[PDB]
Amino acid sequence: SVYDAAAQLTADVKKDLRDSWKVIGSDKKGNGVALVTTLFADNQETIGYFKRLGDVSQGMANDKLRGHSITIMYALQNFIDQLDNPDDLVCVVEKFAVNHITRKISAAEFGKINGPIKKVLASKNFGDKYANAWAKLVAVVQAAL
Amino acid sequence: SVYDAAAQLTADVKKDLRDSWKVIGSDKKGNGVALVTTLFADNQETIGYFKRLGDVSQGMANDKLRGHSITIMYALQNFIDQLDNPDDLVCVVEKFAVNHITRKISAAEFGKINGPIKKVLASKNFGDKYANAWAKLVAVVQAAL
C-alpha cells in the first residue's frame, strides 16, 4: 500500500531529502525547468504527452512550460512538508496520482523522472546517496499508480 | 486582461498579502480545509463540482478532501512567491486557470471564494483591509477564466 511505502521512509532518508531540497527547492523556476527539459532530452518518447504545453524546445521562453515547471516544484514542496505525517503524505500523493492516472501514466513511466532528478541533484553536487533517497519518495507515488 | 489585473498588485497590496500569508499559510491543512468547508457551507450550489471528493460534509475525516485542501494552499503559496515577477505570476495563474476552465468554472463562480477567505482571515484577526488585498489576487485568476 502507499501507506506502507510512506511509513518506510526512515529518519536518515527524510534528512537527506530535506537537506537536498533546501538547495534544489530554492530555485523552483530554474531547477523546475531543468527537470522537465532533461526529461524530454533523455526520454523523447514522453514529449507527446505534454502537447498542451506547445513547443517544449522553447524552454524558459515557453510561458506554458514555465508555469508547469514551477508548479511541479510545489508538488514536491508539498511532499517534503508532509514527511513526518504519513497520513497527510498519503492523501496528497493520491491526489497527484489521480492527475497522472487520468493521463494514462503508469508506475513504470512515472519512474522515468528518476534519471532527471539524479542529474539535477548532481548539478548541485548531491551524490548517489541523495538520488537513492529521492527514488524512495518517487516510489511512494508509484505505489499509488 | 490578466496583465492589467496583475498590475493592480501594488507595493501596499503585496505587503498585505505577504504579512497575512505568514499566518494563514503556517497551517495549510487546518486553514485549507477551513476554506473549502466554508465554501460548501455558504455556497451549497458549488458542491456538485466536487463530485470526485465524495462526501465533503465529513470535512477533515475525508482523505480526498484533506488532500485537495492542502494542495490548494500550495497554489496560493505559489502565487505569493511569484509576486516579485509579474511574468512568472501570470504563467502560473494561467496554468491553474486551465484547471478550472476544464471544470466549467466561470470567473463569477471562482469569485465565490472571496467570502470564505474573508471569514478565514477574520478568524485570525485580519480585517477587511486584508480581505480586499486577497480579492485583488483572486481577480488576477478571474481575468484568466
Ligand code: HEM
Ligand atoms: C517528480 C515527479 C513528478 C511530479 C511531482 C509531477 C507533478 C505534476 C503536476 C503538479 C501536474 C499538474 C496536474 C494538473 O494540473 O492536471 C502534472 C501534470 C502532468 N504530468 Fe507530472 N509529475 C511528475 C512526473 C511526471 C512524469 C515522469 C510524467 C510522464 C512520463 C508526467 C506526466 C504528466 C502529464 C502528461 C501531465 C499533464 C500536463 C498538462 O497537459 O498540463 N509527470 N505533473
Ligand code: HEM
Ligand atoms: C483561492 C482559489 C482557488 C484556488 C487557489 C484553487 C486551486 C485548485 C487546485 C490546485 C486544484 C487542483 C487542480 C487539479 O489537480 O486538477 C483545484 C481543483 C478544483 N477546483 Fe479550485 N481553487 C480555487 C477556487 C475554486 C472555486 C471557487 C471553485 C468552484 C466554484 C473551484 C473548483 C474546482 C474544481 C471543481 C476542482 C476539481 C476538484 C477535483 O475533482 O479534484 N476552485 N483548485
